[PDB]
């Protein structure tokens, strides 16, 4: 669960820049 | 301006995960 949480987290800044 | 924007952007996944 935590590995996945972190993988997802790492990508969030792309979406944020929209 | 753009060069620096992009340099900074590359760091964002650190914050995102931590």
PDB file of N, CA, C and O in Angstrom:
ATOM      1  N   UNK A   1       0.845  -1.186   0.000  1.00  0.00           N
ATOM      2  CA  UNK A   1       0.000   0.000   0.000  1.00  0.00           C
ATOM      3  C   UNK A   1       0.885   1.242   0.000  1.00  0.00           C
ATOM      4  O   UNK A   1       0.633   2.219  -0.716  1.00  0.00           O
ATOM      5  N   UNK A   2       1.900   1.281   0.850  1.00  0.00           N
ATOM      6  CA  UNK A   2       2.722   2.459   0.994  1.00  0.00           C
ATOM      7  C   UNK A   2       3.602   2.696  -0.230  1.00  0.00           C
ATOM      8  O   UNK A   2       3.758   3.857  -0.665  1.00  0.00           O
ATOM      9  N   UNK A   3       4.158   1.646  -0.797  1.00  0.00           N
ATOM     10  CA  UNK A   3       4.948   1.733  -2.041  1.00  0.00           C
ATOM     11  C   UNK A   3       4.112   2.417  -3.095  1.00  0.00           C
ATOM     12  O   UNK A   3       4.558   3.318  -3.827  1.00  0.00           O
ATOM     13  N   UNK A   4       2.843   1.972  -3.238  1.00  0.00           N
ATOM     14  CA  UNK A   4       1.957   2.521  -4.259  1.00  0.00           C
ATOM     15  C   UNK A   4       1.633   3.968  -3.956  1.00  0.00           C
ATOM     16  O   UNK A   4       1.685   4.835  -4.854  1.00  0.00           O
ATOM     17  N   UNK A   5       1.298   4.276  -2.696  1.00  0.00           N
ATOM     18  CA  UNK A   5       1.013   5.652  -2.274  1.00  0.00           C
ATOM     19  C   UNK A   5       2.146   6.559  -2.769  1.00  0.00           C
ATOM     20  O   UNK A   5       1.924   7.675  -3.259  1.00  0.00           O
ATOM     21  N   UNK A   6       3.376   6.121  -2.550  1.00  0.00           N
ATOM     22  CA  UNK A   6       4.563   6.936  -2.840  1.00  0.00           C
ATOM     23  C   UNK A   6       4.804   7.092  -4.336  1.00  0.00           C
ATOM     24  O   UNK A   6       5.147   8.196  -4.782  1.00  0.00           O
ATOM     25  N   UNK A   7       4.669   6.000  -5.086  1.00  0.00           N
ATOM     26  CA  UNK A   7       4.812   6.044  -6.557  1.00  0.00           C
ATOM     27  C   UNK A   7       3.846   7.117  -7.097  1.00  0.00           C
ATOM     28  O   UNK A   7       4.227   7.980  -7.884  1.00  0.00           O
ATOM     29  N   UNK A   8       2.572   7.016  -6.703  1.00  0.00           N
ATOM     30  CA  UNK A   8       1.525   7.957  -7.149  1.00  0.00           C
ATOM     31  C   UNK A   8       1.958   9.385  -6.765  1.00  0.00           C
ATOM     32  O   UNK A   8       1.882  10.319  -7.559  1.00  0.00           O
ATOM     33  N   UNK A   9       2.355   9.558  -5.508  1.00  0.00           N
ATOM     34  CA  UNK A   9       2.695  10.872  -4.973  1.00  0.00           C
ATOM     35  C   UNK A   9       3.721  11.538  -5.902  1.00  0.00           C
ATOM     36  O   UNK A   9       3.626  12.735  -6.223  1.00  0.00           O
ATOM     37  N   UNK A  10       4.727  10.768  -6.304  1.00  0.00           N
ATOM     38  CA  UNK A  10       5.844  11.304  -7.054  1.00  0.00           C
ATOM     39  C   UNK A  10       5.438  11.951  -8.373  1.00  0.00           C
ATOM     40  O   UNK A  10       6.155  12.833  -8.859  1.00  0.00           O
ATOM     41  N   UNK A  11       4.349  11.469  -8.967  1.00  0.00           N
ATOM     42  CA  UNK A  11       3.853  11.982 -10.225  1.00  0.00           C
ATOM     43  C   UNK A  11       2.922  13.178 -10.083  1.00  0.00           C
ATOM     44  O   UNK A  11       2.725  13.919 -11.054  1.00  0.00           O
ATOM     45  N   UNK A  12       2.304  13.342  -8.920  1.00  0.00           N
ATOM     46  CA  UNK A  12       1.293  14.382  -8.716  1.00  0.00           C
ATOM     47  C   UNK A  12       1.772  15.767  -9.182  1.00  0.00           C
ATOM     48  O   UNK A  12       0.943  16.540  -9.666  1.00  0.00           O
ATOM     49  N   UNK A  13       3.055  16.137  -9.010  1.00  0.00           N
ATOM     50  CA  UNK A  13       3.449  17.467  -9.464  1.00  0.00           C
ATOM     51  C   UNK A  13       3.219  17.765 -10.934  1.00  0.00           C
ATOM     52  O   UNK A  13       3.162  18.933 -11.294  1.00  0.00           O
ATOM     53  N   UNK A  14       3.137  16.733 -11.785  1.00  0.00           N
ATOM     54  CA  UNK A  14       2.813  17.017 -13.190  1.00  0.00           C
ATOM     55  C   UNK A  14       1.407  17.599 -13.297  1.00  0.00           C
ATOM     56  O   UNK A  14       1.190  18.654 -13.897  1.00  0.00           O
ATOM     57  N   UNK A  15       0.426  16.874 -12.738  1.00  0.00           N
ATOM     58  CA  UNK A  15      -0.975  17.324 -12.786  1.00  0.00           C
ATOM     59  C   UNK A  15      -1.080  18.726 -12.214  1.00  0.00           C
ATOM     60  O   UNK A  15      -1.817  19.586 -12.714  1.00  0.00           O
ATOM     61  N   UNK A  16      -0.357  18.970 -11.119  1.00  0.00           N
ATOM     62  CA  UNK A  16      -0.422  20.222 -10.349  1.00  0.00           C
ATOM     63  C   UNK A  16      -0.100  21.425 -11.248  1.00  0.00           C
ATOM     64  O   UNK A  16      -0.589  22.519 -11.034  1.00  0.00           O
ATOM     65  N   UNK A  17       0.771  21.221 -12.236  1.00  0.00           N
ATOM     66  CA  UNK A  17       1.259  22.296 -13.090  1.00  0.00           C
ATOM     67  C   UNK A  17       0.280  22.683 -14.194  1.00  0.00           C
ATOM     68  O   UNK A  17       0.614  23.603 -14.964  1.00  0.00           O
ATOM     69  N   UNK A  18      -0.873  22.074 -14.286  1.00  0.00           N
ATOM     70  CA  UNK A  18      -2.037  22.418 -15.035  1.00  0.00           C
ATOM     71  C   UNK A  18      -2.973  23.316 -14.340  1.00  0.00           C
ATOM     72  O   UNK A  18      -2.503  24.404 -13.680  1.00  0.00           O
TER      73      UNK A  18
ATOM     74  N   UNK B   1      14.615  32.317 -17.719  1.00  0.00           N
ATOM     75  CA  UNK B   1      13.405  32.163 -16.937  1.00  0.00           C
ATOM     76  C   UNK B   1      12.917  30.709 -17.093  1.00  0.00           C
ATOM     77  O   UNK B   1      12.639  30.020 -16.096  1.00  0.00           O
ATOM     78  N   UNK B   2      12.764  30.242 -18.321  1.00  0.00           N
ATOM     79  CA  UNK B   2      12.263  28.904 -18.558  1.00  0.00           C
ATOM     80  C   UNK B   2      13.231  27.808 -18.107  1.00  0.00           C
ATOM     81  O   UNK B   2      12.792  26.804 -17.535  1.00  0.00           O
ATOM     82  N   UNK B   3      14.513  28.010 -18.338  1.00  0.00           N
ATOM     83  CA  UNK B   3      15.545  27.068 -17.922  1.00  0.00           C
ATOM     84  C   UNK B   3      15.394  26.822 -16.412  1.00  0.00           C
ATOM     85  O   UNK B   3      15.454  25.689 -15.931  1.00  0.00           O
ATOM     86  N   UNK B   4      15.267  27.910 -15.644  1.00  0.00           N
ATOM     87  CA  UNK B   4      15.188  27.802 -14.184  1.00  0.00           C
ATOM     88  C   UNK B   4      13.851  27.196 -13.762  1.00  0.00           C
ATOM     89  O   UNK B   4      13.836  26.378 -12.814  1.00  0.00           O
ATOM     90  N   UNK B   5      12.760  27.557 -14.380  1.00  0.00           N
ATOM     91  CA  UNK B   5      11.444  26.956 -14.112  1.00  0.00           C
ATOM     92  C   UNK B   5      11.602  25.433 -14.200  1.00  0.00           C
ATOM     93  O   UNK B   5      11.089  24.676 -13.356  1.00  0.00           O
ATOM     94  N   UNK B   6      12.258  24.974 -15.254  1.00  0.00           N
ATOM     95  CA  UNK B   6      12.347  23.539 -15.507  1.00  0.00           C
ATOM     96  C   UNK B   6      13.294  22.832 -14.546  1.00  0.00           C
ATOM     97  O   UNK B   6      12.994  21.728 -14.087  1.00  0.00           O
ATOM     98  N   UNK B   7      14.414  23.471 -14.221  1.00  0.00           N
ATOM     99  CA  UNK B   7      15.354  22.955 -13.214  1.00  0.00           C
ATOM    100  C   UNK B   7      14.555  22.683 -11.916  1.00  0.00           C
ATOM    101  O   UNK B   7      14.603  21.599 -11.346  1.00  0.00           O
ATOM    102  N   UNK B   8      13.824  23.705 -11.469  1.00  0.00           N
ATOM    103  CA  UNK B   8      13.057  23.626 -10.211  1.00  0.00           C
ATOM    104  C   UNK B   8      12.044  22.477 -10.317  1.00  0.00           C
ATOM    105  O   UNK B   8      11.893  21.673  -9.380  1.00  0.00           O
ATOM    106  N   UNK B   9      11.336  22.406 -11.416  1.00  0.00           N
ATOM    107  CA  UNK B   9      10.260  21.428 -11.633  1.00  0.00           C
ATOM    108  C   UNK B   9      10.834  20.021 -11.384  1.00  0.00           C
ATOM    109  O   UNK B   9      10.159  19.164 -10.800  1.00  0.00           O
ATOM    110  N   UNK B  10      12.040  19.773 -11.861  1.00  0.00           N
ATOM    111  CA  UNK B  10      12.632  18.454 -11.766  1.00  0.00           C
ATOM    112  C   UNK B  10      12.787  17.965 -10.321  1.00  0.00           C
ATOM    113  O   UNK B  10      12.901  16.765 -10.102  1.00  0.00           O
ATOM    114  N   UNK B  11      12.848  18.909  -9.362  1.00  0.00           N
ATOM    115  CA  UNK B  11      12.938  18.583  -7.954  1.00  0.00           C
ATOM    116  C   UNK B  11      11.615  18.224  -7.298  1.00  0.00           C
ATOM    117  O   UNK B  11      11.609  17.652  -6.212  1.00  0.00           O
ATOM    118  N   UNK B  12      10.512  18.612  -7.923  1.00  0.00           N
ATOM    119  CA  UNK B  12       9.197  18.555  -7.271  1.00  0.00           C
ATOM    120  C   UNK B  12       8.907  17.115  -6.755  1.00  0.00           C
ATOM    121  O   UNK B  12       8.268  16.986  -5.697  1.00  0.00           O
ATOM    122  N   UNK B  13       9.276  16.047  -7.460  1.00  0.00           N
ATOM    123  CA  UNK B  13       8.912  14.700  -6.943  1.00  0.00           C
ATOM    124  C   UNK B  13       9.518  14.376  -5.606  1.00  0.00           C
ATOM    125  O   UNK B  13       8.995  13.478  -4.912  1.00  0.00           O
ATOM    126  N   UNK B  14      10.607  15.030  -5.204  1.00  0.00           N
ATOM    127  CA  UNK B  14      11.160  14.837  -3.872  1.00  0.00           C
ATOM    128  C   UNK B  14      10.143  15.267  -2.806  1.00  0.00           C
ATOM    129  O   UNK B  14       9.790  14.519  -1.904  1.00  0.00           O
ATOM    130  N   UNK B  15       9.711  16.528  -2.913  1.00  0.00           N
ATOM    131  CA  UNK B  15       8.750  17.085  -1.979  1.00  0.00           C
ATOM    132  C   UNK B  15       7.492  16.185  -1.945  1.00  0.00           C
ATOM    133  O   UNK B  15       6.923  15.892  -0.897  1.00  0.00           O
ATOM    134  N   UNK B  16       7.045  15.798  -3.124  1.00  0.00           N
ATOM    135  CA  UNK B  16       5.776  15.077  -3.299  1.00  0.00           C
ATOM    136  C   UNK B  16       5.806  13.785  -2.471  1.00  0.00           C
ATOM    137  O   UNK B  16       4.797  13.379  -1.902  1.00  0.00           O
ATOM    138  N   UNK B  17       6.948  13.097  -2.486  1.00  0.00           N
ATOM    139  CA  UNK B  17       7.060  11.808  -1.815  1.00  0.00           C
ATOM    140  C   UNK B  17       7.312  11.928  -0.316  1.00  0.00           C
ATOM    141  O   UNK B  17       6.885  11.028   0.422  1.00  0.00           O
ATOM    142  N   UNK B  18       8.060  12.923   0.114  1.00  0.00           N
ATOM    143  CA  UNK B  18       8.474  13.219   1.456  1.00  0.00           C
ATOM    144  C   UNK B  18       7.560  13.941   2.213  1.00  0.00           C
ATOM    145  O   UNK B  18       7.614  15.285   1.832  1.00  0.00           O
TER     146      UNK B  18
END
